[PDB]
Design a binder for this molecule. Sequence first.
Ligand code: NAG
Ligand code: ZN
Length: 1014
Amino acid sequence: CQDVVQDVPNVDVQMLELYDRMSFKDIDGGVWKQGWNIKYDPLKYNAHHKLKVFVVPHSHNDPGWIQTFEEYYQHDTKHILSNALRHLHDNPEMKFIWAEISYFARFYHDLGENKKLQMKSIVKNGQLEFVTGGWVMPDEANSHWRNVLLQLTEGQTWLKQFMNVTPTASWAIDPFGHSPTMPYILQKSGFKNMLIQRTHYSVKKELAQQRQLEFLWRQIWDNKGDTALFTHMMPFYSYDIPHTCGPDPKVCCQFDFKRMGSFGLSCPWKVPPRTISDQNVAARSDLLVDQWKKKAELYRTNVLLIPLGDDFRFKQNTEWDVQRVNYERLFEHINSQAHFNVQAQFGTLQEYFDAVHQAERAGQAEFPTLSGDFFTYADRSDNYWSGYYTSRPYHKRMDRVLMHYVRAAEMLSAWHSWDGMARIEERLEQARRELSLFQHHDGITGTAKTHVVVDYEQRMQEALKACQMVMQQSVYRLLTKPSIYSPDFSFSYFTLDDSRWPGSGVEDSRTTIILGEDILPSKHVVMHNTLPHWREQLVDFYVSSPFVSVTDLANNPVEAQVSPVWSWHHDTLTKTIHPQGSTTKYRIIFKARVPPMGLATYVLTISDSKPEHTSYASNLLLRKNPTSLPLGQYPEDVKFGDPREISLRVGNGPTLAFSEQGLLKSIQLTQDSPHVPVHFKFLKYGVRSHGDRSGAYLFLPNGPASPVELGQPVVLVTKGKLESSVSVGLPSVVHQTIMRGGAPEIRNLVDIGSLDNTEIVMRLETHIDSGDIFYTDLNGLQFIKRRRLDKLPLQANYYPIPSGMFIEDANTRLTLLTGQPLGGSSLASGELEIMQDRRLASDDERGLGQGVLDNKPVLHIYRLVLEKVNNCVRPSKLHPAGYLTSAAHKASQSLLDPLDKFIFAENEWIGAQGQFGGDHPSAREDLDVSVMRRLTKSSAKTQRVGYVLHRTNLMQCGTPEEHTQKLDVCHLLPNVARCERTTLTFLQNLEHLDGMVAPEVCPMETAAYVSSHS
Ligand SMILES: *[C@H]1O[C@H](CO)[C@@H](O)[C@H](O)[C@H]1NC(C)=O
Ligand SMILES: [Zn+2]
């Protein structure tokens, strides 16, 4: 195993280093506005060394953006695919690449058999080529790597099955900035090449000047280079035709033959395309070839990529003809005119890369190595696309919830083979596809029109319901005596209970477990732990009486705490934000202990009075002018007081001090250690009154954020033996700090309401001497070092915070983990900040045609980890990565993959069992079974189950290792006949494993295994 901490990779281009050096001046470079006038030596190409040009037709089809997926499919995409089928069938030399399999699968399934055969034929013969082959072309900033893999697999499994092809070249022309997470997954999924387009214009300029637009992109910690994936970065401002034939859009526009009038399109540079004829073909070729040779100067081989396409192009048959015929006249003239020394033709993406590598292999070029990412993207001037790291945060949070439900559903149902009648496969496929669809770069990015966002939400909601059905049928089967198990596949044996989604104050969706001597004395509940190690976590349930005790299935008492159910109300009469306690339902909380990838059953029983093992939290409402807060049968009276500073400590955990406004001000790790200054503060960014406006994409603040005026907020303090909390009703945010004995959990119920042109940010102020350094993660896969650059505007120093961020000095680190992707930064030494929501009245000119005025209440969750790191073995100062500690990593897992909770829905569960998986291996803490998915239906003689195993890398800080067993996923199910290591999509077998044993992987590595069972 490579050491991912101590050896700094030596690469030709390291993006953080490059950023530190570049000036980013936005100078008018002439026709190539963000470059310079490219010059070339006409003698470079000659009879013995021609410029081979591949014109690659394409059509960017967004699976929802300004229309929904189905509206685009009906209005555009099915026509584009129907016409591509016909035109390619009829013109053997024409080529076309297709990226979005969600649309392709939708189309293909609707085709009659004759057409399906024709389609398979033009794919088999090389005319229609799939690039990437994912369900979508995902966002690369907010997406979790697990979902990026899911959607890649969903599209590629479909392609393998129906088209019998697996793309090895990736095409990503529209995500707003690019992540090294893509080559990481692609290279482990059989890919050999990839292409990206939206990178900062200064980066394009800089790499173009060094002919570093093509590089072997390896991971920032990869010293050896085995993660390397050849990457082609396009040079220009857009993937449209004006910006893909060469440096001068005014000339390239003349070669987009769809811009002539009848199609309603034209060239904004005022020179229109002209039909090619024998009389103008030489002059038109003179121009075009000159653009091609200029573009070629930016690369190292004699093979040139010329994308030919734009959004939803190649729709009309007349469009296919006008593009094809004119280009064919150009090629016939150009290839027969020796003085150009060019051979041009239509080609596919793979053809381009194959030829590039043939040149490489002929020793014609050597490519630079590169590590780093391509955030935050700016397409021009100071228009940095960091706004979408936060836009529509409700759905960004919903993405992580569904991410986990899909994993839990596939995992829980994987243990058994299911009769087709149970419709397990059907529900899982729907869930995977709706979550996969949302990975689209107008999905989770929050950059779609309002009615499209609604479509994605509805799709995700049905996916959540599908996961729940599968999960609950699976639990019932796993914990019921086999000879008693009598499933009704449409029956709800259990109701899932989720305490954080939609979340208290977002939706009253949790069921109350109703107990009573005259109706039901007790209720079984079950917890599932998708993580491959024994895990304890507090869980809570609403119950109709505060007098409830908990026992496990051996009937041992489990210590529990009951607290009131508090809801905050923006009281439009008193004009205050204050809490009301339920007088009919209460929260019972207890520590569940659950086996690795397993289940544990508990029982909640009512009694007429306080049970022996249940304690009650005290509650204190701090505000001037209080009124009574009755809590029905709750046994402890609420106390009142004027606002004041308070301190709390749960268990042996840290002691936290809060200001009289209910906000954290310090953390004391142990009883005599210092009260470390850690202050939460909420601020607001506005929008510029002149100049460019922030929108769904762009963050264009009118200066540093200003503090939210808090007034004298109502602060509620609940103190219990297992869980205490401090909640405060601030304008737009009910901010809650929850303590359970370790790092606190922070929850913000964010309702930006009607505050127009406002972005609410949550900032942490500490005295950590972090200087200009901070770390943020990329797709929940790795942490990359960021350096705040004052030579760039504030919005450029904002980065995606998909799952966590931290600052540290030599001795102390503060890590903020998130249950949802949001944008954030460290704008000053000792600070961390992360945007909560943003509401913008204006469109920001990237085509969306609206601002963001559809905000809705969202419950953001976090874990805040203050730690000493002076004893941790950290990377050197020059290393571009950072790594979590055991505690921060576990804190991230508690947000992304909490225990799942199930309430038995009927009065009595006959044949109930207490636990499942007590014999599953409890693997080392840095290892995760990211995916467990049965790959065969029940009628398959040889059953196959796929596993994706990921090991992160945690810092060694002096804590002795301890126990753990080796996890061999191939022996998790019985009767194993074969164990194979495979690509991450499970589509290709890479290694037959001796003894049918699946080895664990190395730190930061990810492997996929498939076990076959007789
Ligand atoms: C397709 O898969 C591979 C690639 O061509 C080939 O060897 C095999 O014969 C094909 N199978 C078909 C046509 O289904
Ligand atoms: Zn797009």
